[PDB]
Amino acid sequence: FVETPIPDVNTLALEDIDVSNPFLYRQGQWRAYFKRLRDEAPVHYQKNSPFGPFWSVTRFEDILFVDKSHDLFSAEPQIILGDPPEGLSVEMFIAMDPPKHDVQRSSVQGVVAPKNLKEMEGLIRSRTGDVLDSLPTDKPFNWVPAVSKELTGRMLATLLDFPYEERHKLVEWSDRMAGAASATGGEFADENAMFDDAADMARSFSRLWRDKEARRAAGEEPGFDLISLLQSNKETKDLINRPMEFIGNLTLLIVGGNDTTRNSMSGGLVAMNEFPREFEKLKAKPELIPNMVSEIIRWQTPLAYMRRIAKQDVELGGQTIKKGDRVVMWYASGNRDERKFDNPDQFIIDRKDARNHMSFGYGVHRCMGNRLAELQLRILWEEILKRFDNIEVVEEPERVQSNFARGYSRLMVKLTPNS
Numbered sequence: 001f002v003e004t005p006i007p008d009v010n011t012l013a014l015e016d017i018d019v020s021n022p023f024l025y026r027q028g029q030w031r032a033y034f035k036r037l038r039d040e041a042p043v044h045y046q047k048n049s050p051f052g053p054f055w056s057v058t059r060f061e062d063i064l065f066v067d068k069s070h071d072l073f074s075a076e077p078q079i080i081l082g083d084p085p086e087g088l089s090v091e092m093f094i095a096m097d098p099p100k101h102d103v104q105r106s107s108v109q110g111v112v113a114p115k116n117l118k119e120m121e122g123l124i125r126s127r128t129g130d131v132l133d134s135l136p137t138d139k140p141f142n143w144v145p146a147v148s149k150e151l152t153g154r155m156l157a158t159l160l161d162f163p164y165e166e167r168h169k170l171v172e173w174s175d176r177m178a179g180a181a182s183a184t185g186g187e188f189a190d191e192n193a194m195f196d197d198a199a200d201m202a203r204s205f206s207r208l209w210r211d212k213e214a215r216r217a218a219g220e221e222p223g224f225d226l227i228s229l230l231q232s233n234k235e236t237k238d239l240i241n242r243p244m245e246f247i248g249n250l251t252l253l254i255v256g257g258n259d260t261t262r263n264s265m266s267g268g269l270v271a272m273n274e275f276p277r278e279f280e281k282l283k284a285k286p287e288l289i290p291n292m293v294s295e296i297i298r299w300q301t302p303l304a305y306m307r308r309i310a311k312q313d314v315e316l317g318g319q320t321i322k323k324g325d326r327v328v329m330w331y332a333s334g335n336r337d338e339r340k341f342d343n344p345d346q347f348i349i350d351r352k353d354a355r356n357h358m359s360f361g362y363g364v365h366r367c368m369g370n371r372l373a374e375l376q377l378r379i380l381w382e383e384i385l386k387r388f389d390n391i392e393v394v395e396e397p398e399r400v401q402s403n404f405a406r407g408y409s410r411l412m413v414k415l416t417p418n419s
């Protein structure tokens with residue numbers, strides 16, 4: 001993939017609108033392209049793309065139907081638009097249908113048990129406050145590494161009890177995975193690097209499993225982390241011996257929580273910068289933080305879509321999706337659908353229906369980590385409000401190349417503390 005200027009959507013025949021282009025978000029053309037699809041081709045077939053042909057489903061109501069109807073639309077074998085590079089396919093329950101999906105999700109869902117998240121609030125808030133206190137207030141800095149990636153990486157390490165000093169690896173491996181050119185149009189096109197990483201990652205999870213079992217056998221009390229949970233349950237105490245399940249489950253937790261958390265933490269600042277009256281509203285009414293977090297997640301939509309395959313011919317939106325066709329559920333478009341949300345492109349932190357967004361999906365795959373993400377975002381903004389009278393974005397944000405992740409690689413921020 002090489003970036004070129006994306007033309008006005010009005011220059012295109014409807015059949016030539018290709019929303020798999022991974023520069024549509026960066027260039028700001030995604031809003032007009034998806035509005036044209038919602039209005040005039042809400043169930044749209046693209047015959048020609050670098051990823052092969054695919055349907056786009058772009059209205060909120062129709063996306064709900066596809067996401068909930070796993071008897072008609074399969075999540076197998078992959079949920080990104082393209083294909084993983086050869087040798088890198090791993091089975092993850094995000095790309096599995098019931099009943100097996102339900103079985104595999106049950107084996108890990110305890111890691112985000114509400115009682116466990118509540119016990120970790122002090123740690124999350126301490127990390128958040130320490131990170132914010134460390135930021136300079138006399139010069140701008142890049143928020144993406146300093147805050148969003150920093151906090152996400154610590155959280156991911158805690159979730160796995162992954163060696164804290166190596167947490168940068170959970171994220172580097174994960175980035176090169178979720179950013180495969182063949183899968184998402186991301187910038188990673190070297191299969192040699194992905195082979196090195198996927199193997200390093202698999203070896204690292206195996207060493208962690210053995211270190212944790214040796215520590216448990218030696219009398220270490222079990223913790224909140226996923227490995228401890230897997231080793232405490234009869235069904236999964238032997239998960240090492242099922243390598244596809246073991247590697248797939250652990251990889252899904254890390255990839256699932258990595259750039260989603262990161263880009264939600266960054267995106268709230270970008271939304272405030274575009275709608276600065278909302279920050280004055282927030283400072284005057286801090287009890288809006290929980291609803292604001294929903295509005296940040298709606299407006300940002302950190303994952304633009306999830307993909308499905310039609311299990312049979314399905315009539316949708318005056319169109320016949322054929323058995324075997326790839327069907328892309330464009331959450332990024334659904335969350336801007338004016339049939340669902342009034343003034344959808346506005347960031348409105350007291351929007352009463354913000355919580356009804358589809359950024360987590362709907363149906364059996366609805367995000368397992370939704371409460372953990374919301375918790376971290378709430379604490380982030382609580383701790384921001386204690387410290388800063390103003391936040392300024394000093395340069396146009398740099399947006400990531402991807403058709404899947406909607407995110408930022410550079411967000412240059414100047415802080416003004418209160419007195």
Ligand code: HEM
Binds near residue numbers: 159252257366373
């Ligand atoms: C604001 C942040 C997040 C967003 C926007 C998001 C988005 C999503 C989406 C769109 C799906 C699939 C929904 C569908 O197909 O219907 C999903 C599933 C999933 N997410 Fe998240 N996610 C976020 C945070 C997290 C975090 C923090 C974690 C882990 C700590 C996580 C782990 C997972 C897992 C394991 C699944 C698979 C659930 C299943 O297939 O049953 N996510 N997420």
